[PDB]
Design an enzyme around this catalytic site. Structure first.
Site, PDB file in Angstrom:
ATOM      1  NE  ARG B 524      -1.593  -0.844   4.137  1.00 43.75           N
ATOM      2  CZ  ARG B 524      -2.614  -1.216   4.900  1.00 43.75           C
ATOM      3  NH1 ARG B 524      -3.573  -0.347   5.192  1.00 43.75           N
ATOM      4  NH2 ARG B 524      -2.682  -2.458   5.365  1.00 43.75           N
ATOM      5  CB  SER B 588       8.999  -5.917   5.174  1.00 44.41           C
ATOM      6  OG  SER B 588       8.227  -4.860   5.715  1.00 44.41           O
ATOM      7  CG  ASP B 642       8.391  -5.022   8.497  1.00 41.41           C
ATOM      8  OD1 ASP B 642       9.590  -5.097   8.143  1.00 41.41           O
ATOM      9  OD2 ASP B 642       7.684  -6.027   8.762  1.00 41.41           O
TER      10      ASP B 642
HETATM   11  O1  LIG Z   1       0.640  -8.365   7.156  1.00 39.46           O
HETATM   12  P1  LIG Z   1       1.697  -8.965   8.052  1.00 39.46           P
HETATM   13  O2  LIG Z   1       3.013  -9.256   7.378  1.00 39.46           O
HETATM   14  O3  LIG Z   1       1.222 -10.091   8.928  1.00 39.46           O
HETATM   15  O4  LIG Z   1       2.026  -7.787   9.088  1.00 39.46           O
HETATM   16  C1  LIG Z   1       3.206  -7.025   8.898  1.00 39.46           C
HETATM   17  C2  LIG Z   1       2.825  -5.638   8.420  1.00 39.46           C
HETATM   18  O5  LIG Z   1       2.054  -5.006   9.435  1.00 39.46           O
HETATM   19  C3  LIG Z   1       1.629  -3.693   9.080  1.00 39.46           C
HETATM   20  C4  LIG Z   1       2.836  -2.797   8.831  1.00 39.46           C
HETATM   21  O6  LIG Z   1       2.402  -1.494   8.417  1.00 39.46           O
HETATM   22  C5  LIG Z   1       3.723  -3.421   7.764  1.00 39.46           C
HETATM   23  O7  LIG Z   1       4.933  -2.675   7.602  1.00 39.46           O
HETATM   24  C6  LIG Z   1       4.083  -4.828   8.188  1.00 39.46           C
HETATM   25  O8  LIG Z   1       4.879  -5.440   7.172  1.00 39.46           O
HETATM   26  O1  LIG Z   2       7.857  -8.809   7.695  1.00 39.85           O
HETATM   27  C1  LIG Z   2       8.610  -8.723   8.901  1.00 39.85           C
HETATM   28  C2  LIG Z   2      10.032  -9.242   8.663  1.00 39.85           C
HETATM   29  O2  LIG Z   2      10.037 -10.275   7.673  1.00 39.85           O
HETATM   30  C3  LIG Z   2      11.356 -10.749   7.466  1.00 39.85           C
HETATM   31  O3  LIG Z   2      11.331 -11.897   6.641  1.00 39.85           O
HETATM   32  C4  LIG Z   2      12.027  -9.623   6.712  1.00 39.85           C
HETATM   33  O4  LIG Z   2      13.288 -10.058   6.217  1.00 39.85           O
HETATM   34  C5  LIG Z   2      12.219  -8.460   7.669  1.00 39.85           C
HETATM   35  O5  LIG Z   2      12.795  -7.348   6.977  1.00 39.85           O
HETATM   36  C6  LIG Z   2      10.875  -8.042   8.251  1.00 39.85           C
HETATM   37  O6  LIG Z   2      11.120  -7.235   9.396  1.00 39.85           O
END
Ligand SMILES: O=P(O)(O)OC[C@H]1OC[C@H](O)[C@@H](O)[C@@H]1O
Ligand SMILES: OC[C@H]1O[C@@H](O)[C@H](O)[C@@H](O)[C@@H]1O
Ligand SMILES: O=P(O)(O)OC[C@H]1OC[C@H](O)[C@@H](O)[C@@H]1O
Ligand SMILES: O=P(O)(O)OC[C@H]1OC[C@H](O)[C@@H](O)[C@@H]1O
Ligand SMILES: O=P(O)(O)OC[C@H]1OC[C@H](O)[C@@H](O)[C@@H]1O
Ligand SMILES: OC[C@H]1O[C@@H](O)[C@H](O)[C@@H](O)[C@@H]1O
Ligand SMILES: OC[C@H]1O[C@@H](O)[C@H](O)[C@@H](O)[C@@H]1O
Ligand SMILES: OC[C@H]1O[C@@H](O)[C@H](O)[C@@H](O)[C@@H]1O
Ligand code: NA
Ligand code: NA
Ligand code: NA
Ligand code: NA
EC number: 2.7.1.1
Lengths: 899, 899
Positions: B524, B588, B642
């Site tokens: 996003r 990330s 992140d």
């Molecule tokens: O959707 P996921 O990977 O479980 O949660 C991780 C995400 O949470 C929301 C943050 O804004 C984003 O930077 C992060 O990568």
């Molecule tokens: O998405 C959360 C984490 O995922 C890891 O696999 C990434 O290498 C990291 O940069 C990140 O902080």
């Protein structure tokens, strides 16, 4: 027709058919089911949150109320005055505070501080800070409420994201933000959803209103559901308003085949992606922007203005539902479309204006058709509850969209009625808003609040704190001292009577013994056979003999003749008539003794009063009843108090058993004491078992501190007025009564049984130990509780049952606790007597209240452990009765005699 | 003839009519319903305990088991062996061990130490001690079972009364008794009620055998009830043998109008006064003495023996129920009544013998009649289940009385067959008692016990001990140091990358920043306007853009071309296209940074594998796609992880925050390290937030220690084999896959899904974070869990759903702990860096697994508290995403750039 024709074929998926709508409807019908079932609720998107509003106004609401309205297009605060008995019906004044975008998307704290401040500015103007005005809270979001004055925000919706609010009780968050200011007090009595609020408003003028509906920024509906259908609320009586919370509907992919690439794109730009799907297709906050999307899609595809596209068209929220309304005005319908589409940079031709107005139409209609579909479900739902071919009902509505749209109201109605054939529906429009309704709920809210306050304010007097408890122990200690020191013994209430038992069993006790067990809930004759040496065994049989009420309160001569009578019968039953046997007599009463086989009944207690016994030696009374027979003869070596017998029965095992306790009909405790302390008996060599008779504790007022109007009453109507005060706050023969009297009171006060003092409730004995233990039983169901009570002769509802349970809980708790402070003082004295820094002692226990109560033993043990930390107390429960312990004293009796 | 027509009227109370037995029946039919419904169950005297036996033996039963039978006329020990595979018919050698009344009446200790000493001898006679033998237990008493592997003695009955047994686990109790002996190992697979053991013994020879009946020392019945009727067992599938426990029938005073002066007396002299009333009416232990009391009564009023009443007639139990059986013989009945009555010492006349023998008849004829009334209600109930207008079933039976009394069976059946004529019942008597049916049970129980043990044996590998977690922690710390030191860094798995962010927001951050959020579940673009000063505000907007399957695993250029594209649209969506603004790019993935605005991708993680990206500076790769579109222009001021972004987000408001935690798709952490320790960045003043990248933990082997077969399969089939190993035991993108492998395995082993691996189960991605969270929800209904499984397409039963759940639990719990040890190491270091004893710190968390999972956070917080007792960590949940934090970063970025 060319233009319009093409568009319709374009936005085809956004034109729902009666067939489909019926489909949608049958779905929401299931969703309501799953939102109500306890099994599937934790997965249903439509939550069906109970609201604890049991019905629309019954006109009997009066007072001065303040209502907050947050979550709507505007944050409003009102004052509602309702006075029927004074020719004044409903007056209400309100003020609309601005809440900036930052505030709504910022930290919860900002938000609720902002609210409290407004409430402060509001109350300052009306100069009413000094008035205790009940406060209602219209919080238009889904909430987890277990009681009307608790609002756990499940999840923001519409325009709100506030940090640190979800999963919290907004009722508190506010209370909080209100206290940090200090400018005033707020008695937030209730929190309601804007649908509920609106339904209550409309239902104030329409006794038939059974549904609230909001088609504004967001869209949701609340209706009246049978408690029998609300799994998540213990009950089956009457009705309660359910807050369907239908915006969520289809959030589980349920409506994917209905959502369109537009509904998905509008979503990916929403403030809460993935949620409130159904809402994002209906409510006003979306409809406009939902258009702007379609428009752009078209203009790029050449369907509009030669395909021109200005930044203003691409900008977010440049096309409000507001504009979407004016474009639907027939009079300015197309005309307006000109001024709007012109301000959007594009070059709006006459054909265009037509095309656009049609898109709008397709959209606006869908939302309207959709809501019709669900509202229909709700309607069908309500009818089914009545079991009647037709259904008549009013529906309170509100929502800026509904109010200001020139076609929606009409279309929605048309479609709805078409979808629910067998029913006449009235759509009453709230013009004041949910304010009047909030206050109406706040009225019943506060009316109920007061009842509680009083109840708790009363029960509070039964709450003993760690300190009060310590104090009791302390006094208990003092009283023990007085009881021992022959100097003060005469004026001492706790008698600390000597039992003339000097040492716990040693394992040599051998022979056959006739035992008597009298004073409990069961008189019985025992036969105990003991063997000592290489293998030790203790066989024993016993028979229960009823003692008729007359005899129990007749005369000593009769009673004791009845005893010797039973004594004889049991000798037969045992086939041991003949040889002259030794007998251990367990008499459960404060007896003055000089030897093991001599005891003068100091006073009657509990249920007994037999004439011409007091001041007598019960051993004599007995040997005299036997002589008055001559069928047999036997040697009563001992009279034993049951606390002591118990101990012995347990000290059998269990050498560290140096304490006896009984919590049954009466409450009392014994223990081993160093002869040096037993001033009332000569010697300072060895120990001695002391029958405390701690029941009398407080018979001098040392407890008038924590004694209640209820204890007093119970004491007063007792056979032993003013005596055994302590006991009467513990044992089963009393606790029930304590409660009964509270209930009676609570009843006249109007809190139970609709103010009707059952004839039954006026009966003493009702709440026996047995029954009292069944009620408090853990994880029991309201219907179960109400059942146990119906079987007593108490016509009580759930609410009622909740109170009675609550009461029994308080009374039994204070009991277990007081009892604890008692034992606490005992063991801690022993520890100090023996100069240890920590003591390991086990306590033998017996008594039905203790055996049968769900929490007594636990509540109490925890208490002993908390007051006397330097003591580590065990609680061995006696299962054989005093008999064994009794025969063990008897033997040491026959022995010491010969030896 | 008047000699008997008289007694027939005297004991008129004890002659129940057909009209009566119908009432009784109807009432017991109600009592059963009460014992089943979860609501009134606790109030019911007829407990209706579940038995955990799903049906009578079918034949597959095979093995060699030992069977215990206690509580009966005699304590029996038998051996059962059966195997139709090897064509071996049921073989079974038994035996009996004496049991003195002293034991049966002594303490649990003695008793079970005795039962153990017997089985000890029994196995020391067949020398079967060595063979691990499944042992089953008949007892004979009412018991509470959740396992069937366990028995909670509700209450003693019949002859038995043992100290310390009640409300305890007879199983655990015996186990101990054996343990102390050390003589052998006996593993007790299951316990059953002799009523169950019987029905099983019969059902084995006969099907339609759905009922179990006992009429010996005591009486009782068990049957086959529909699971959808047993409220107290999560289920609905099939049926289970319910143990009625009818002996306690009417203990509540329901049968006060059937009990006579006689019943009341035998009770007042029984071991269990007030209890097992119905039984005391009907059972072998009572019939004899119930007589003796009717005889002493009459003999008192001179109706017997000229009214002569000797001592032997008064003595308790001088009249055996053996005599009640002998006296009712057709040929020698009166002949025995003479010898028996003469033994009494009453001079017996040829008239007395005829009167007495009739007394018996009225007694026993009653007992039987009663059993009829009840067993009738059972039969009827069965007929209701089947729905058949007629019930055709078989009733296994046993019990000294029913087995030795000549008139009884005869009378009993007939009375039954009449009360419920709407049926055809076969009364198969049991010839082996229960030993067979018991072993027929121990077999299935043992079958299950084996699967279980096996599953447990497997899951036990996911169990980490306090010490293991500490060791993990320790290792983490080790790797942390390796990553920080310039010497060992190149080879350190835990990279400790620098984010070039040096301090948490400081309140000066002001301006408008665009943002990127790439690498999560949602890609996003954002817009974050910050306003510092006295009045600070944060306004932000965002739009979720999907990254198509291809673009994500295609080409570096494609990926960023798509990003730039979306970036473009969004500039539109906000209508801010043109100006050149600073962009905070939240990427990330592990990046080697040389400055805030330079980040070279180290390695792809998670879902992504865009080609020609590794080695490149992501900033560049971005700018490149920017020039290429040549539409708008941006001033990328920073790249941010992140973890870092999230800390900054949360730190904005909470300044005590210095740690970032992300438990979502992948897992990783960041914290404020002392510049003096960042041996990889010149300088050593102030601090610098380090991007740990702790996913790689264990990648150098330091975790193979705690990794399982299943872990290896997941990592092996992963996109990045042998990488991010630690993460692949924690994050949502993998837990599911771990579970899938476990289940798949358990399926091939036959434990699930009838050993058929569904095409579904082989689909990877099945167990999303969304679903995993649901299954593990608290207080959820199996019916619900089974529902969720069939949603994913897994056709699962109740038992399956239970195992799956257990599985998910095990894996999420491990992940939650491994994550905790991870943190625990992080904070414990911060504690040292500041040289504190106690350290308060807060972490900024985010991630769908962390947000949605019902246990992860708790267990993870619990873990950090146990592993770093000297730190006090608070986990603040980020609700706004990285956007804000990354903006605050980009703010300071620009402050240095425009510097
Ligand atoms: O959707 P996921 O990977 O479980 O949660 C991780 C995400 O949470 C929301 C943050 O804004 C984003 O930077 C992060 O990568
Ligand atoms: O998405 C959360 C984490 O995922 C890891 O696999 C990434 O290498 C990291 O940069 C990140 O902080
Ligand atoms: O103002 P909106 O959200 O468009 O319409 C809905 C609102 O209507 C005004 C009512 O007073 C309020 O309770 C309700 O929530
Ligand atoms: O029956 P209650 O009064 O509740 O318990 C107290 C009674 O317990 C049974 C004991 O054998 C008896 O000595 C004692 O007095
Ligand atoms: O032997 P009793 O108690 O008279 O009759 C009942 C007994 O029948 C024989 C069975 O082996 C046993 O499990 C059951 O308890
Ligand atoms: O504004 C009316 C409705 O808006 C919806 O978004 C909320 O979920 C409801 O609680 C509310 O009744
Ligand atoms: O029955 C238990 C206790 O009841 C008290 O009220 C009696 O006064 C004591 O003698 C007895 O120990
Ligand atoms: O042994 C026959 C019956 O005796 C009763 O006293 C027990 O409570 C039952 O568990 C048993 O089935
Ligand atoms: Na209900
Ligand atoms: Na003394
Ligand atoms: Na069930
Ligand atoms: Na450095």
């Amino acid at each position: 027709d060319d233009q319009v024709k093409k568009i319709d074929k374009y936005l085809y998926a956004m034109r729902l058919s009666d067939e489909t709508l019926i489909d949608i409807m049958t779905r929401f019908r299931k969703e309501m089911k799953n939102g109500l079932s306890r099994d599937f609720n934790p997965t249903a998107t439509v939550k069906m949150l109970p609201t604890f509003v049991r019905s629309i106004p019954d006109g009997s609401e009066k007072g001065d109320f303040i209502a907050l309205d947050l979550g709507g297009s505007s944050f409003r605060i009102l004052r509602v005055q309702v006075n029927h008995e004074k020719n004044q019906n409903v007056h209400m004044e309100s003020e609309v505070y601005d809440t900036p975008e930052n505030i709504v998307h910022g930290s919860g704290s900002q938000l609720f501080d902002h609210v409290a401040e407004c409430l402060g500015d509001f109350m300052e103007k009306r100069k009413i800070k000094d008035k205790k005005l009940p406060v209602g809270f219209t919080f238009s979001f889904p909430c987890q409420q277990s009681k009307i004055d608790e609002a756990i925000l499940i999840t923001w919706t519409k325009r709100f994201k506030a940090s640190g609010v979800e999963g919290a009780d907004v009722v508190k968050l506010l209370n909080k933000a209100i206290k940090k200011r200090g400018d005033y007090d707020a008695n937030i009595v209730a929190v309601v959803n804007d649908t509920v609020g609106t339904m209550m408003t409309c239902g104030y003028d329409d006794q038939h209103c059974e549904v609230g509906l909001i088609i504004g920024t967001g869209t949701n509906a609340c209706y009246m559901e049978e408690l029998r259908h609300i799994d998540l609320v213990e009950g089956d009586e009457g009705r309660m308003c359910i807050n369907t919370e239908w915006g969520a509907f289809g959030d589980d992919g349920s409506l994917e085949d209905i959502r369109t690439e537009f509904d998905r794109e509008i979503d990916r730009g929403s403030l809460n992606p993935g949620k409130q799907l159904f809402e994002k297709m209906v409510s006003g906050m979306y409809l406009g922007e939902l258009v702007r999307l379609i428009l752009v899609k078209m203009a790029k595809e050449g369907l509009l203005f030669e395909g021109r596209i200005t930044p203003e068209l691409l900008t977010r929220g440049k096309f409000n539902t507001s504009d979407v309304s004016a474009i639907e005005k027939n009079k300015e319908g197309l005309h307006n479309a000109k001024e709007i589409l012109t301000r959007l940079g594009v070059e709006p031709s006459d054909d265009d204006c037509v095309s656009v107005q049609h898109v709008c139409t397709i959209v606006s209609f869908r939302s309207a058709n959709l809501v019709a579909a669900t509202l229909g479900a709700i309607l069908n739902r309500l009818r089914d509850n009545k079991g009647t071919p037709r259904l008549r009902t009013t529906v309170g509505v509100d929502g800026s969209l509904y109010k200001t749209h020139p076609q929606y109201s009409r279309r929605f109605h048309k479609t709805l009625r078409r979808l629910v054939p067998d029913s006449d529906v009235r759509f009453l429009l709230s013009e004041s808003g949910s304010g009047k309704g909030a206050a109406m709920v706040t009225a019943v809210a506060y009316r109920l609040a007061e009842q509680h306050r009083q109840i708790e304010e009363t029960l509070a007097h039964f709450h003993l704190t760690k300190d009060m408890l310590l104090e009791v122990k302390k006094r208990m200690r003092a009283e023990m001292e007085l009881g021992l020191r022959k100097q003060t013994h005469n004026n001492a209430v706790v008698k600390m009577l000597p039992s003339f038992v000097r040492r716990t069993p040693d394992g040599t006790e051998n022979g056959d013994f006739l035992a008597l067990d009298l004073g409990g809930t069961n008189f019985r004759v025992l036969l105990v056979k003991i063997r000592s040496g290489k293998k030790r065994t203790v066989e024993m049989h016993n028979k229960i003999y009823a003692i008729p009420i007359e005899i129990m309160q007749g005369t000593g001569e009769e009673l004791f003749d009845h005893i010797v009578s039973c004594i004889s019968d049991f000798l037969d039953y045992m086939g041991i008539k003949g040889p002259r046997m030794p007998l251990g007599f367990t008499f459960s009463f404060p007896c003055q003794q000089t030897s093991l086989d001599a005891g003068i009944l100091i006073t009657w207690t509990k249920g007994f009063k037999a004439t011409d016994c007091v001041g007598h030696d019960v051993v004599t009374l007995l040997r005299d009843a036997i002589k008055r027979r001559e069928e047999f003869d036997l040697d009563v070596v001992a009279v034993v108090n049951d606390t002591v017998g118990t101990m012995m029965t347990c000290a059998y095992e269990e050498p560290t058993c140096e304490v006896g306790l009984i919590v049954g009909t009466g409450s009392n405790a014994c223990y081993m004491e160093e002869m040096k302390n037993v001033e009332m008996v000569e010697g300072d060599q060895g120990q001695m078992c002391i029958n405390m008779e701690w029941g009398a504790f407080g018979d001098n007022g040392c407890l008038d501190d924590i004694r209640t109007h209820y204890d007093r009453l119970v004491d007063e109507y007792s056979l032993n007025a003013g005596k055994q005060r302590y006991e009467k706050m513990i044992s089963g023969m009393y606790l029930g009564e304590i409660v009964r009297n509270i209930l009676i009171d609570f009843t006249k006060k109007g809190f139970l049984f609709r103010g009707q003092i059952s004839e039954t409730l006026k009966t003493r004995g009702i709440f026996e130990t047995k029954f009292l233990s069944q009620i408090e039983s853990d994880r029991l169901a309201l219907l179960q509780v109400r059942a146990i009570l119906q079987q007593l002769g108490l016509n009580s509802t759930c609410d009622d049952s909740i109170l009675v349970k609550t009461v029994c809980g308080v009374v039994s708790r204070r009991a277990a606790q007081l009892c604890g402070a008692g034992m606490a003082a005992v063991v801690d004295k022993i520890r100090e007597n023996r100069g240890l820094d920590r003591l390991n002692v086990t306590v033998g226990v017996d008594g039905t209240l203790y055996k049968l109560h769900p929490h007594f033993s636990r509540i109490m043990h925890q208490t002993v452990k908390e007051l006397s930390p330097k003591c580590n107390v065990s609680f061995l429960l006696s299962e054989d009765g005093s008999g064994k312990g009794a025969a063990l004293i008897t033997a040491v009796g026959v022995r010491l005699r010969t030896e």
